[PDB]
Write a protein that binds this ligand. Structure first.
Ligand SMILES: COc1ccc(C2=NN(C(C)C)C(=O)C2(C)C)cc1OC1CCCC1
Ligand SMILES: [Mg+2]
Ligand SMILES: [Zn+2]
Length: 329
């Protein structure tokens, strides 16, 4: 009734679960490709979510196992490892000193559950690819946030599988509030909403208020959900803020996925999407452009909101940016 030796090495890696820079690829290897299940289980136990929401542990494991199985093992980036990474990154952001005692257990559950489902059943191609190919998903969702609508529908539908309803003991009021917040968070992961999310986060930093020394005041749903939306969006765009050994693995995987979409586009005689042409590729320049135009403006604004809690992450992002710049030939 004590762990195998592989389960021990996994348990020792999972001691890093509260730190930016977890060996998530090593956790994927040690868990038999179960990073999402073991990281979600660890976070739920750590935050006492099973007791708070009366989640039977067998139901939690069955749902997590089912959810993880609906991420595609043949997709290089948008897979269970990326889901596990965004969950664990959201978990660390929720622990930021500037947000201590700000969020309810229901809001914490929403942010973590949203992170876990936010890319489920991703086919490894973009919304524009799905729209241009007249795919069933684009037709179901009227070409609007096709993938993000689909991730939500699958994440919720999987609750109806045998012993998978982890919310079975929540009141209707709790379930309606959880459901609305999860939908609002995952729809905000659509990059077409990035500029509006960032504009609203900047407005909040300019008008920010702190109460009882240090900790953010968020007194309406609009502000509370905007911060959770930006938090999970930051977690989703967190790769360039990680130690470079992790960042380079994420860059290899996103480039494999993008080049594969570009190959699908070229073989069909479609216009090849930005950064998807492996014959016309500038990986280093693209990463510097990605950091300069998207990731740095977002994380700089987040860093202001929670000043100074995110200084080390912003420092790592700036170091990684200089490393990629220095390798442009
Ligand atoms: C590790 O590096 C990355 C991780 C995620 C992304 C994404 N890009 N986008 C949009 C903006 C196209 C997205 O939705 C996501 C967030 C999936 C991009 C990355 O870097 C690439 C940009 C151009 C080539 C290298
Ligand atoms: Mg997504
Ligand atoms: Zn994602």
């Amino acid at each position: 009734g004590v762990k195998t030796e592989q389960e021990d090495v996994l348990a020792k890696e999972l001691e890093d679960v509260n730190k930016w820079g977890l060996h998530v690829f090593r956790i994927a290897e040690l868990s038999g490709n179960r990073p999402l299940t073991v990281i979600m289980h660890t976070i739920f136990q750590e935050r006492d979510l099973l007791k708070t929401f009366k989640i039977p542990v067998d139901t939690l494991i069955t749902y997590l196992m089912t959810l993880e199985d609906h991420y595609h093992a043949d997709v290089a980036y948008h897979n269970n490892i990326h889901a596990a990474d965004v969950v664990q990154s959201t978990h660390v952001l929720l622990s930021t000193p500037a947000l201590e005692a700000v969020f309810t257990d229901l809001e914490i559950l929403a942010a973590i559950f949203a992170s876990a489902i936010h890319d489920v059943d991703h086919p490894g191609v973009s919304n524009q690819f799905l729209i241009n190919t007249n795919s069933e998903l684009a037709l179901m969702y009227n070409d609007s946030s096709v993938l993000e609508n689909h991730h939500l529908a699958v994440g919720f539908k999987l609750l109806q599988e045998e012993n998978c309803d982890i919310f079975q003991n929540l009141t209707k009021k709790q379930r309606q509030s959880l459901r609305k917040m999860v939908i609002d968070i995952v729809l905000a992961t659509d990059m077409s909403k990035h500029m509006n999310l960032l504009a609203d986060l900047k407005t909040m930093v300019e008008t920010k208020k702190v109460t009882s020394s240090g900790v953010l005041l968020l007194d309406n749903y609009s502000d509370r959900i905007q911060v959770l939306q930006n938090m999970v969006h930051c977690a989703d765009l967190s790769n360039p803020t990680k130690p470079l050994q992790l960042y380079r693995q994420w860059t290899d995987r996103i480039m494999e996925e993008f080049f594969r979409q570009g190959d699908r586009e070229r073989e069909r005689g479609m216009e090849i999407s930005p950064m998807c042409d492996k014959h016309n590729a500038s990986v280093e320049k693209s990463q510097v452009g990605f950091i300069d135009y998207i990731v740095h403006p977002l994380w700089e604004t987040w860093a202001d909101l929670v000043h100074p809690d995110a200084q080390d992450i912003l420092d790592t992002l700036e170091d990684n940016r200089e490393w990629y710049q220095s390798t442009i030939p």
